[PDB]
């Protein structure tokens, strides 16, 4: 592993060169354990007290889990107050 390098410029070099590679099997092994960690984490952290998607801040206002519950909320609750306003005018407010 010892190589003495002769370069005229600065100094001599004592390069080691430990050529190595994670065994072919060990790459499958680290994939195996990481799929195990993914499995464990999916199960356990799905079984966790998820503090944002439980409260009346999210599930109360809208909160179906989509990305449009805000927009259908602010597009339907004004129609809800227009409906309530018409039903108010139906009894002469």
């Amino acid at each position: 592993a010892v190589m003495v390098q002769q370069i005229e410029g600065m100094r001599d070099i004592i390069t080691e060169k430990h050529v190595w590679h994670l065994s072919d099997k060990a790459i499958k092994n680290v994939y195996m354990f990481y799929i195990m960690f993914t499995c464990w984490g999916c199960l356990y952290f799905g079984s966790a007290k998820d503090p944002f998607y439980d409260s009346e801040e999210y599930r109360g206002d809208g909160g179906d889990g989509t990305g449009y519950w805000v927009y259908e909320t602010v597009c339907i609750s004004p129609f809800l107050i227009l409906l309530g306003k018409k039903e108010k005018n139906l009894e002469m407010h």
Binding site: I7, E8, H18
Partner: protein, 677 residues
Amino acid sequence: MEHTYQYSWIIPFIPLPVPILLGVGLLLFPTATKNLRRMWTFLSIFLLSIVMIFSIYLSIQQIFLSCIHQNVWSWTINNEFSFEFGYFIDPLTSIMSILITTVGILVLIYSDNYMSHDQGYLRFFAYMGFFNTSMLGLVTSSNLIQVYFFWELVGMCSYLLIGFWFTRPIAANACQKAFVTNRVGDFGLLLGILGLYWITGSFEFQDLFEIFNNLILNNRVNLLFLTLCAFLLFVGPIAKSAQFPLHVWLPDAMEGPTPISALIHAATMVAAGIFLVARLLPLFIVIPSIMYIISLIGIITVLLGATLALAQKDIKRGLAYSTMSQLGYMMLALGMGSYRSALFHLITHAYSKALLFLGSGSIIHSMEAIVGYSPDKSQNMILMGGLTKHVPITKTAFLIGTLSLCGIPPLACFWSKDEILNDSLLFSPIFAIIACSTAGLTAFYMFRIYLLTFEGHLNTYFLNYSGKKSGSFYSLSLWGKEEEKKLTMNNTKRASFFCNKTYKISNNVRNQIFITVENFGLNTRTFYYPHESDNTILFPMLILVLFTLFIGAINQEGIDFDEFLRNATFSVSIAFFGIFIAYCLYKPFYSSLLNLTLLNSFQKWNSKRIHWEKLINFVYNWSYNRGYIDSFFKTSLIESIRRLAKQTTFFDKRIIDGITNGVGITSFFVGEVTKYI
């Protein structure tokens, strides 16, 4: 040698596990790891102490034995990569390793108390330890792959440290500009190492040194490709060492902490570019024109870094431009081909201005009790005034630092700048006398900084200036039980109650009844004067004083590691000339040592302020507008990209999404027409 270089791979990885534990601690269990608040501090300090002792041991073996170790391992072996991540122990590795570790340990001892009143504590030390990890991996690097790797990681850590105080948006602009500028240098380092791989096919620091002895003698390679490759390879050190094109990231780094001013510069990270150029000098002396380019960029930025620090209101920005001008001195030394004096000037500046930044932050933390918390108040060098009477050890440390930059031979650092100008004047006459002129300017602004900070009255508790101070000192009036039972609501006393009548004038009285209702007395009366900081601030300043006194006298170790009186007295004369010009302008009359006849004649010769009214205007507008280069880069480089981004999303959304949407629009239209035909 037999068993100590095989375990040289740990000196990047030893700081690493405490940012690993903080990065999984603060991100997962913030109350837990913040309950262990001061323990990760001492753990980072202890791991950096291990790296310090091991780097000192490697330095002792480098000064004893002349050898280089290149303990390379394998990283990827699939095809032409065969990549390595090994650790290259030259004397430059030893210099850079002790330069990282000692400054990092002292900044961590400082930062235990700098951040001790900060809610953001452990993520700062995670950034610190990961930065020390990255920079020690950068200096122990056997190939341009790993230099590139830890180079960009150092740039990321610069982004994180400058945008540490993330809640203030000027630090947000600062850290974005910083990381983008570091990526403009990263750009050049990329197509510079790829150009070297096209010219060599090396990707190793070993084989470049034995290919560039005969690569230029070949016919396939072009000299134009080699010089543009070396210039792009130099674009990286421009961004790290804050050279003239890519310098606009450095003075905005002030909005983060003062330890990152002591560590991002005057230290490791601006020494990354110096390390890179000095490591690649065996392939920079070979390419003929790049040496002149490095000399040119250095000699352009030394006039920029000098003239910028002349009129800074901020202490931290002024010391930043001082750091940038000394880094320009280092690049001017690297353009000399000086393999020795460049690194020695790097050592003495990186131990001098680091002390200067810690003294500045001690000044700042003393001023925090006066002005509260504000950088336009607690970092404004104008209203610092004088702190010799209050914080004496800070005064001595800051003074030894500023004399270490002003070039004082016996009790400060001068031999570095002596070697700079000695290697400068026998090189080219254009570059030399302007370098000595910038040295005189450097002594001028550094002594200006020292006089505005420590010498004179305070400028903030001064009874001519602060009205709350005059209201607080005089709890009772000058007559006691006369003239008032105290008077509040002092009316418009233009006549001063003298019943003065008026001659021909515009008006004397009117319908204007405005009473100057002043504030009261005997309330928050104390106004606690700036006392000394604790032991964790003085102790790195004492150790850095011991450094800058110890390095400042270094039958010498100039050759085994890697005009005498006239030039020395000329440099001391132009430096003391800068001392004298700053001294007659800023040192007040009651404490100056000069004769009052000459002191009276200074203002008697210069009471006009007409031939000064343009000079002071031009210098202040230069140092305030940053040579207009900040405004030009924010006008035609980043807002040019903003206009290009808006034009390009116009072309996207309107006239290539327009075609795709228009296919369906046309199908709707032909359907509606052919329905009704």
